[PDB]
Design a protein around this motif. Structure first.
Motif, PDB file in Angstrom:
ATOM      1  N   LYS B  69      30.907  32.752   8.864  1.00 47.14           N
ATOM      2  CA  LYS B  69      30.201  31.504   9.000  1.00 47.14           C
ATOM      3  C   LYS B  69      28.990  31.627   9.918  1.00 47.14           C
ATOM      4  O   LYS B  69      27.843  31.413   9.476  1.00 47.14           O
ATOM      5  N   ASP B  70      29.222  32.089  11.140  1.00 45.20           N
ATOM      6  CA  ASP B  70      28.111  32.186  12.079  1.00 45.20           C
ATOM      7  C   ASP B  70      27.070  33.220  11.667  1.00 45.20           C
ATOM      8  O   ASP B  70      25.861  32.983  11.797  1.00 45.20           O
ATOM      9  N   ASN B 120      29.371  23.903  11.070  1.00 47.07           N
ATOM     10  CA  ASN B 120      30.210  25.068  11.171  1.00 47.07           C
ATOM     11  C   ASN B 120      31.613  24.509  11.407  1.00 47.07           C
ATOM     12  O   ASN B 120      31.892  24.049  12.499  1.00 47.07           O
TER      13      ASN B 120
HETATM   14 MG   LIG Z   1      32.046  30.510  13.707  1.00 55.52          MG
END
Ligand SMILES: [Mg+2]
Ligand SMILES: Nc1ncnc2c1ncn2[C@@H]1O[C@H](COP(=O)(O)OP(=O)(O)CP(=O)(O)O)[C@@H](O)[C@H]1O
Ligand SMILES: Nc1ncnc2c1ncn2[C@@H]1O[C@H](COP(=O)(O)OP(=O)(O)CP(=O)(O)O)[C@@H](O)[C@H]1O
Ligand SMILES: Nc1ncnc2c1ncn2[C@@H]1O[C@H](COP(=O)(O)OP(=O)(O)CP(=O)(O)O)[C@@H](O)[C@H]1O
Ligand SMILES: Nc1ncnc2c1ncn2[C@@H]1O[C@H](COP(=O)(O)OP(=O)(O)CP(=O)(O)O)[C@@H](O)[C@H]1O
Ligand SMILES: [Mg+2]
Ligand SMILES: [Mg+2]
Ligand SMILES: [Mg+2]
Ligand SMILES: [Mg+2]
Ligand SMILES: [Mg+2]
Ligand SMILES: [Mg+2]
Ligand SMILES: [Mg+2]
Ligand SMILES: [Mg+2]
Ligand SMILES: [Mg+2]
Lengths: 288, 295, 294, 288
Positions: B69-70, B120
């Motif tokens: 995700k990041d 997120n």
């Molecule tokens: Mg993350």
């Protein structure tokens, strides 16, 4: 230096030309140095966000079409989204006027680890606020003397910025110093280029009547609020390429001062992590 | 419509979506180059979106730890200019957040028209960890709340919230980064072994693995319950970073294409006033300004 | 249920008179009973706050000078400050209009245990919003059909209020139904009484030209959004004393349905607390006021 | 009275302020009645303050558990109308609040002009439990932050924040409810023994008593460092609820009297337009 003001009552706006380019005369050299700075800004941002120790406000204060949005865009689009906010300070709403003038500004201060860009700032309250004497027409207590409003704002701004410094938030204060004629060139481009027409407003044009009083208000503000911890930067704004170079240099050198690092975990944490590593390796028969 | 896009209810089988599919672009260097071209197009669309101030966009990532995700947010969405962008990680709810209703914190983060908010994690956590750990059974709520319908009412209320947003000029891109348990382990090992990544590892990261299968079922349930034409899910294979970044870049470009932002065309009234401003500016400098029109 | 509307498409505004007083014909009786109700509201509020299980929105929607502020003041000053917010919905700011219309409303919903008074509400978006077609002048996506904006708002409002109910937040929706003439009387008082002059505005007078359209919009909204869980109350507003009585009755009876209680601690917590009691008593050589004198 | 009001720096000796002083009004029934008179006046002033929209008021209670904060707020301020009132309890900071600077969450809650916000606890927690438990030693902050000057800088910054608020039409009433350790114990025993009060008792309430004397020192230090003419501290004996409620009612009513709110008088132009509307309304109903 020539552009950094870091003491009180030490600023003469007439000595800071709008078209100085003395740090880098060659446009292609400056464009390239900017790109080097931008890569370093990115790298520092990643470390800042990992460490969660210190926040950074990057504040641009300037007349319309001086270069705020285009400088923000070109120099800081390289940043990752994580931990970044951009806050334009527009004409205050009824709610914002009903509160104290720093309420909406303090609300937008970054967390530790994070970067907030201010497009305009609390300084509007001693710029347009001073030039149009807006305090005279605003609701306030009878005991507030109009004759001390602006001086009290300079003191309170000094105090707020120092409070932030003392609590792990730095502020970069950038004045993009544009000429009246270059503003006019940029306005004509906003009118003539259909893709820019959305950026032009009546109030953009109407501020020009007060140009000299705004210049005086900038000079007064910079005299009243420049300190070692919270300096002003007076950036020549007549050439976008040079302004973007100088701003990139200010941001990278401020991040270098902050000196962020990826955190070192404690020896106890590391031993627990080594335990988890072994369990993961055992689960897959050491084939990872 | 697609292999990865789920756009109808009760149409999703998680076991049919492999974590290591790479069928849209098998060549890594081709995909890397196409991603860079996509990123430039995302930036260009963003500039028009921001100028027009008509429609907002949520880009939401929901996935296990170390699914990407990041990393995907950083590598793909660093394309965006700062103006009009917020990134909102949804963490374990605070006291205040729990005292409110679960969509309160999520609705507060919705973008303005012209703006982009990256989530997120998201409101879906309330039917993922919320379902897996039955957190509603330990939370304060009215005696009349039927525990047996809490989750089904959440799917209904989420459908209705997302449709409400669509009806009010806010689109949502919902991306599930579908990582394998083994690749998660590989990425965890890197977080442990690489000093620059040690800050990203936590006890809770390792501890969620015990519930791996329950989380998978909760994802499947959520995607079955909330995929619509207006608010689809995208199920993105996550085992190869380069491919996941390519696919996410493609989803974002194609959604912005559908939004079709344009620089605004000003009214006749504005045009008349602009002509007057132009003349005043020109007259002030005796016509010695750069103009693209004749004099 | 003469004033409560709890089903869709079941409302005829012309059957609801602005000067009905049939629940309590005697003014002085009503004034006394309102005082008793206010004490009961306070008692319920204390239990609600202690329990932290359920939140309550008390929403007033009405024309100017129908009696929203005066009813809020006289009835709901009963409340202790803890856990209470009052939120007036005014003309939306630039930021609020840049967001979706429920953004500012959802932000103000109470926590469990707490009470939020809405002076105006999300219903403004289907009242003045419908009457003046404000959606036609607002920024929105080209794909938004202007012709279905209002109908989508009724569906979305139904859905939002049901969502709140499913998440431990009740809403009391009160329409204070004033007559055009009594509004005129109250406007005259705002003009003639110096201490009330601040409350009169040009926009107050100017809304009277749209009186009938507003009445129709109220009727439409109550038809479209009245449910068993989220009813509307149509309160005759021509007499302040009676309106305040009826509102106090609605609030008491809603709190009674919520049935708040002081929480009971767990057995574990009780054992710990008994240990702390002993330690406190030993520290003062038993010279504390205990209700178990030993 | 000047026995309870501290309005100068470095002028405070906590040991000379007994928890059971009752010298302003020895008769309980007289005090209860004067409280009711005060409450009627507070209500009247609240109505005018809201109409005028010139000045806001913070009523801040800072005190140990069971000193009387909630019960005093309730009994003295329940007579307030709901319009323009907020009550904000400051609890243990959330992750987001700790990520921001310590005044962020406090400044966000400041009232608008015309409005009253009650603070149950306050920014002073950051120099009370923050000082007692040295919380800053365990919190994320920049490496350059001197741990040895954190608390002194907080007193400076709190002085400056409160002055800034005063300069911007927001007053703060700072009330220390000075309860004895024994009376706290009596009140805690009631919380344990009465089932309807058990929800108000917590392990942390009991655990704070181990630090009683350090808290007393922190209160003394804070009041020495932050008491000014514009932002005084009130040290209210808290061992008798009736007397504490009386004194608090007196502080609030006298502060409102200083604010001197009035219903606004509209301009002559507005009055003439209103007279136009009056005639139109009368004509519509044939002067009925
Ligand atoms: Mg993350
Ligand atoms: N504290 C404050 N008081 C008054 N005006 C303020 C202010 N802070 C910002 N402003 C003004 O708001 C404007 C914001 O400029 P921006 O370029 O974002 O919007 P705009 O030009 O479309 C708004 P306008 O509708 O006023 O023309 C500037 O004129 C700025 O001076
Ligand atoms: N509505 C909700 N209810 C419960 N947990 C939630 C939640 N929303 C998010 N969370 C959880 O919060 C966590 C957020 O993880 P993130 O990776 O951001 O780390 P973090 O900064 O919260 C500390 P850690 O690394 O220890 O989890 C995840 O476990 C996620 O499931
Ligand atoms: N969503 C919405 N869209 C448009 N207008 C809205 C709205 N919500 C509220 N409003 C309008 O804002 C106004 C709120 O009135 P407010 O209490 O701010 O005072 P006012 O400006 O009418 C002065 P007075 O005290 O004299 O009535 C009403 O006219 C109401 O319809
Ligand atoms: N700035 C801050 N730093 C640390 N603690 C803070 C603080 N501000 C408030 N607190 C603490 O939060 C607590 C809030 O008091 P209150 O009596 O409302 O809560 P509480 O007892 O419900 C928490 P718990 O039940 O978990 O102990 C007090 O211990 C107070 O000192
Ligand atoms: Mg700009
Ligand atoms: Mg970027
Ligand atoms: Mg402008
Ligand atoms: Mg986790
Ligand atoms: Mg009103
Ligand atoms: Mg009250
Ligand atoms: Mg009106
Ligand atoms: Mg308390
Ligand atoms: Mg405590």
């Amino acid at each position: 230096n020539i552009y950094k003001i870091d003491k009180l009552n030490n600023f003469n706006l007439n000595n800071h030309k709008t078209d100085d380019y003395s740090l880098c005369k060659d446009k292609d050299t400056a464009l390239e140095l900017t790109q080097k700075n931008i890569q370093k800004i990115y790298d520092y941002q990643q470390k800042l966000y990992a460490e969660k120790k210190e926040g950074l406000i990057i504040a641009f204060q300037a007349m319309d079409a001086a270069g705020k949005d285009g400088t923000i865009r070109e120099v800081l689009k390289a940043l990752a989204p994580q931990g970044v906010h951009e806050k334009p300070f527009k004409s205050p709403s009824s709610t914002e006027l009903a509160h104290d003038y720093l309420w909406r500004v303090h609300n937008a201060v970054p967390e530790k680890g994070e970067i907030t860009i201010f497009n305009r700032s609390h300084y509007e309250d001693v710029l347009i606020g001073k030039v149009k004497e807006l305090y005279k027409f605003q609701n306030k207590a009878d005991r507030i003397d109009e004759n001390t409003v602006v001086d009290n704002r300079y003191e309170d701004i000094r105090n707020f910025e120092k409070y932030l410094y003392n609590n792990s938030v730095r502020i970069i204060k950038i004045f993009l110093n544009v000429s009246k004629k270059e503003q006019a060139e940029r306005f004509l481009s906003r009118i003539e280029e259909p893709e820019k027409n959305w950026k032009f407003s009546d109030s953009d044009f109407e501020e020009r009547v007060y140009w000299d009083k705004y210049q005086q208000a900038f000079e007064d503000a910079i005299n009243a609020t420049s300190t070692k911890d919270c300096p002003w930067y007076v950036v020549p704004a007549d050439r976008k390429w040079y302004m973007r170079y100088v701003v990139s240099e200010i941001v990278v050198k401020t991040l270098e001062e902050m000196n962020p690092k990826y955190p070192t975990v404690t020896k106890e944490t590391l031993e627990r992590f080594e335990g988890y590593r072994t369990k993961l390796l055992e689960e897959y028969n050491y084939d990872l």
